[PDB]
């Protein structure tokens, strides 16, 4: 398997990249702003399948990991959960979130400014942990560790929702933004080693074929 040495340079380049990313929806989507609306629609449906019900994930608390300005929180999490917490490494994005979230912002418990590879989700606190388009910014070693700590942050019947780009074959390391586009097999291996099981799995439809496929995973 491929391995990345010198993480210090990896994470540092990512911060320099995001310092120049506008705190707007267009910034979050990497100039694929037109894909935000189908992303929201598919996520809302996927979330409804694993939340609310007997033996299903509760609706009390959620965590938005790599939240950016809170695009996912505003349109997916805050309508469903009583309180949502955002965590992101860019304080400029967490600051703008208070504007962008508008009324839904009233249900935000806290804005945590942390890098995920240094963050420990509070123990047994969340019904749902949402990890969207940020797992590629962690090395395989750091992603494995973070998923394990997320699992410990789950309440009873809690789940982790992971949504990200997944290559059909062969990984891509983008040094411009310090991200790894993993493929299906290596991503499943990392999920397995972390002690998590795949509950549900759906490919994002309606996205242009020129884009890397996007997948949603329900994990616990």
């Amino acid at each position: 398997h491929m391995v990345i040495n010198g993480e210090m340079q990896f994470y540092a380049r990512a911060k320099l990249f995001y310092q120049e990313v506008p705190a707007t929806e267009e910034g979050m989507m990497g100039n694929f702003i037109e894909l935000s609306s189908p992303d929201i629609q598919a996520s809302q449906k996927f979330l409804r399948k694993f939340v609310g019900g007997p033996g299903r994930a509760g609706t009390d608390c959620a965590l938005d990991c790599g939240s950016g300005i809170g695009r996912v929180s505003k349109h997916v999490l805050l309508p469903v959960f009583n309180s949502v917490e955002l965590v992101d490494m860019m304080e400029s994005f967490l600051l703008e979130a208070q504007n962008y979230l508008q009324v839904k912002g009233d249900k935000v418990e806290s804005y945590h400014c942390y890098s995920l590879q240094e963050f420990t989700p509070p123990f047994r606190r969340y019904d749902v942990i949402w990890i969207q388009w940020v797992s590629g910014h962690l090395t395989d070693k750091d992603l494995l560790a973070f998923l394990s700590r997320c699992r410990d942050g789950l309440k009873e019947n809690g789940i982790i929702i992971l949504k990200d780009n997944v290559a059909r074959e062969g990984c891509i390391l983008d040094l411009s933004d310090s991200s790894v586009t993993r493929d299906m097999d290596i991503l499943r291996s990392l999920i397995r080693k972390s002690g998590l099981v795949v509950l549900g799995q759906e490919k994002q439809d309606g996205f242009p074929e020129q884009c890397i496929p996007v997948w949603m995973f329900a994990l616990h």
């Binding site: 979050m28 989507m29 990497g30 991200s179 884009c211 890397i212 996007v214």
Partner: peptide, 6 residues
């Protein structure tokens, strides 16, 4: 976010 293919 979304990324282009090769």
């Amino acid at each position: 976010g979304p990324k282009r293919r090769q």
